[model samples]
Structure formats: structure tokens, C-alpha cells
Target chain A: MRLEDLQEELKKDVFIDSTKLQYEAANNVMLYSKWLNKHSSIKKEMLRIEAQKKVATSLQYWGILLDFCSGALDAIKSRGFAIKHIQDMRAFEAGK
Target chain B: MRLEDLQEELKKDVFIDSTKLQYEAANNVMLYSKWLNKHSSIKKEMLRIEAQKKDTSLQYWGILLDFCSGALDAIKSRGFAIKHIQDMRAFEA
Candidate 1:
């Protein structure tokens, strides 16, 4: 869901503060959703693997696990790039 | 701040389910803070270099590079270092 949607949902039950930590969390979730939506294959795999498994559990588990699984996958991809940068740095240092 | 503290702060005026996305953000912030705390030297160096002058930036930069290499060494020691995504893809395949 978009941050606005999450905020609106929260607002229905209580006052919503756009400056609070929940807003940041909602923003993060929206960014993650955007990224997932961009990669259709990964999005399908995530939904198929995580959403399917967690939907049987609970909504709480479904939401949190989906976020964690997507975050972990993104971390792995970024770590690959981090490692590449490290290798290039070492190569430059050695050639100096 | 601790996740509990953050949650308590959030709960003062609102009902907190604890299972919501805000809890996850608090958890991640705590984890990142813990990691940053563990590398106090790097943390200090980061702050120092951030405020250092441009003329002497090269010296502090070399120090930062050394710390980066040390971090890479630690990652390698933990078997988390990957040479390439090809290796990752191959292993996952």
C-alpha cells in the first residue's frame, strides 16, 4: 500500500501524524512496494513464496514477513554490488 | 532509542498493535544503530572525516579506505563476501 493509504487507514482509528515514525515506516513500505512492482518476476516470486505461505498464518505474519523477505532479497542484490566495489578498490590499491 | 521506547512513545496517544510496519522500522533502526555502535572507530572516523577540511581530506580518506578493507575482511571471514553475482546466481541455481 502507498504511505498515504496506510496513513489514511491509521487515521480512521486515531489521529495521524505525518512527521512520526509510522509515516517513515509507511514510506519505506511504499518504496518497497514500488520496487517490487518494478520487477514483475521478483514480485511474482515474492507473492508466490511469501504471501502464499503467510496468508495461511495471519495478517500480522503476512505483512511483516512479506516486508522482511523483500528487504532481504534487495539486501542480497545490493551486497553483490558492494562486493564488486570492494574488489575494484582493492585492485586499484594493488595497482598503485 | 530502543524499540520498546519508540513503541511506548508511539502508544501514548494511539493504540499500538506492535505487529504493524512501524515496529519493523523501529527494529531496523535498532539493528542499524547496534551495527554502527559495534564499529565505534569507524563511527568516530566517519564523523571526523565528515567535518575535516578539503586540503587534508586525502589523509582521512586513506584511513576510511583502510577501515573499509577491514570491514571487507570481516565480511570475508564470515563467509558473506561474494566475488560476483554470477557466483550468487550459480549457487542459487
Candidate 2:
């Protein structure tokens, strides 16, 4: 019965909002990026990554994570108050 | 007729990724935060906002947007590349 109910909802498409999806994708890219830049000397690593990729490809997902810790420290940089936002969210979500 | 034509795709629910939603919300707050810190004196405003709410209140959504331009300018202070991540995704999509 549970499986049957789930399949029924799956049959109907009630989703919309390409703009929201785009915004969400862009936001994720930035969130991880703050971490990436905080750890890697991004200015330095970016040079090497670009040379290897041979294009202006983004290194945020694959290259950056491998090079550094996925933890948050010194992320907001001078903004102490804003740093709380990241910390609060991380704790709220448990970095899930 | 045109509305009905488009309504065909709206019936089925293609939803998943609560992780993605939560991440997206958290991401937005950070992105704007980078902006808020850039302009004016955000350091000073937090004390006031907190006193008003008397809690560790968030001013990112309501207060920050009012004092700033929507355009991306110096949003990511020392980490300028972070700004470009938002920009590149705009272009990528």
C-alpha cells in the first residue's frame, strides 16, 4: 500500500521554477567555493588547475575538495557576524 | 490554449533532494552575507539588530537587501573567486 501510494505521486509532475533551480545551483557553487578559497591558495591552485584542464574550467567540485579539508574555518574572513550564518547552518544541518 | 499547453508538464511531481533544498537555503544566506559585509558597516548593524530581537537574529534576508544593489559587486571581499562561482553558474546555465 505504501509503495502504491508513492508510485501515484510519482506519476504526477507538480514541480516548476527554472529560475529557482538556477539560483539554487549558483548558490551551492558559491557555498563550497568559500571553503575552497579558504583552504587552497586559490589564486595559486587556479593557475595550475587551469593549465592542466586547458580551459577556464571550474575546480570547485573535484579539484578543490581533494586539495583541502571540507571543514569551515575562517570562511567569512573579516565578517565575524556572517561567519555565524555558515556555522549556524552547518550545525543545523550537521553538514549533511 | 497556450496556458493549457504548458500545464501538461505541471502535473507530475519531480521532487527530491531535501539535502539540496537545505543546502540551497544556506548557500543563499552566505552569498548575500558576502555582499552585506562589503558595503557600509555591517559589523555595527548586527549589534543593533540583535538588541532589537534580543536574540542571535539574522538580518541577511530583510535588512541586507535594502541597503545594497542587487548586482554582484565586491560581494566576496578577499575571496573574489567566490563571486565568480555565482557568476559562472549564471553563464553556465
Candidate 3:
């Protein structure tokens, strides 16, 4: 879901200044971003394999894993390419 | 949708392999990350807002933006803390 969607989700239950939340949200983004920026530099791939390897198992690091997954996929998409499925990834890794 | 979900969405189609894609994807992640890290060091919170304002509108950036939102809200409900800043600024330096 979009951040705006999440905001609406929260707002439905209570009132929020939104300004604080915006900054707060923005801060959250930067913090997570910085996390990725720090942890990743090898410019390695196989992101889904590694990216999903973290999530659900690591809820506190949501921003890092999701961004990593999305960013990694997006780069692949740019070359008219895509990571089609879990199975597709396996075959690619398997070289069969 | 989760990247896993996106993967499934495309699966009902044809097939492919990737090695070029992984390193390729890694390149883009680092590429945009530099932009975010730069924006973070800007002096004011409001300025950071300006950075994000343009950031979200750009193509391929929304996921990270959503990540921002998710992390923020989840941190409040859970007991997680903000990720450190220097680590962000230091990379690719």
C-alpha cells in the first residue's frame, strides 16, 4: 500500500496533524534508506533470493528489505527484463 | 504488492534466467541510494521534505517511499529504533 493509503488507514481511527507524521515518515524513509545504503555496496544481485531471505523473519527491518527487493527488481526491469517468479529464480540459479 | 507477489503475478507467463539481472539490480539500488543519502545530509527537516517531495514522484521510487511509511508506523507500534544516519552518508564515499 501507498504511504497515503497507510495514512488514511491510521487517520480513520484517530486524528493526526499529518505534518509530524510526514516528517516522521520521511525520517523513517531516510533512516531505512541509509541502512540499505550502508549495508549494500557490493552491487550484488539475486536480490529476491536474498531480500525475501530477510523479511517476515525480520519485521523491524521492513524498509531495508522491501526497498532492496523493489530496487533490485526495478533495475532488472529497465533492461526489458524481469524476475518472473520464485521458480524462475531457482532455474536461473540452478543453470538448468 | 510484495516483490514475491510481483514474481507470482508474472509467473503465469513464460520463463527466464538471470545473472546479469542481479548485479544489474544491485547497480540501480546503489545508484538511487546515493541520491537519498545526499538528501539526508541537507540541513533542515523541511529541506528533506523537498527532497522527498521530488523523490516520490519519480519513477521507481515509490516503493522506497512506502518503505519509509511502513518503517515509521511500525516503529511506533513495535519497539524498533530509527536506523542510523552516518551509515547512509558514509557509503560510496
lDDT against the true structure, per candidate, is: 0.37, 0.35, 0.32
Model 3: residue A13 alpha-carbon error in angstroms: 43
- Candidate 2 lDDT by residue in tens digits, B1-93: 121221121111111234355453445456556445533454456666766777212434222332232212223331333343344344445
> Which candidate leads the pack in TM-score?
1
- Residue A9 displacement (Å), model 1: 32
What is the alpha-carbon RMSD of candidate 2 to the true structure? 23.0
Off by over 4 Å in 1: A1-56, B1-93
Weakest 10 consecutive residues of candidate 2 chain A by summed lDDT: A69-78
Interface RMSD of 2: 19.5
Off by over 4 Å in 3: A1-56, A81-96, B1-9, B16-93
lDDT of 2 by residue, A1-96 (tens): 133432343233122224454333333323333333333333334445655676543666434433333223222232323432433454467533
Misplaced by over 4 Å in model 2 are A1-96, B1-19, B41-68, B72-93
TM for every model, in the order presented, reads 0.24, 0.17, 0.19
How many collisions per candidate? 0, 8, 1
Question: How displaced is residue A56 in candidate 2, in Å?
Answer: 41
Model 3, span B43-78: residue lDDT tens:
244455667777222322333333333333322311
